[PDB]
Amino acid sequence: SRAVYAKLWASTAQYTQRRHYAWYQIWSRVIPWSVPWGIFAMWMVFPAMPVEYRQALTFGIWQKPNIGTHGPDP
Ligand X SMILES: CCCCCCCCCCCCCCCCCC(=O)OC[C@H](COP(=O)([O-])OCC(O)COP(=O)([O-])OC[C@@H](COC(=O)CCCCCCCCCCCCCCCCC)OC(=O)CCCCCCCCCCCCCCCCC)OC(=O)CCCCCCCCCCCCCCCCC
What is d(CA 42, CA 60) in angstroms, rounded to the nearest whole number? Answer: 17
Give the largest Cα separation in the chain, rounded.
Answer: 103
From the list 2-10, 19-27, 44-52, 58-66, the region that binds other proteins by CB under 8 A is 2-10
Residue 46 makes CB contacts below 8 A (sequence gap 6+) with 54, 57
9 binds, among other proteins, ligand X, none (CB under 5 to 8 A by kind): other proteins
Q: Which of 2, 4, 5, 13 binds other proteins (CB under 8 A)?
A: 13
Least distance from other proteins to the Cβ atom of residue 14, Å: 10
**65, amino acid identity:** P
Q: What residue ranges bind other proteins (CB under 8 A)? A: 6, 9-10, 13
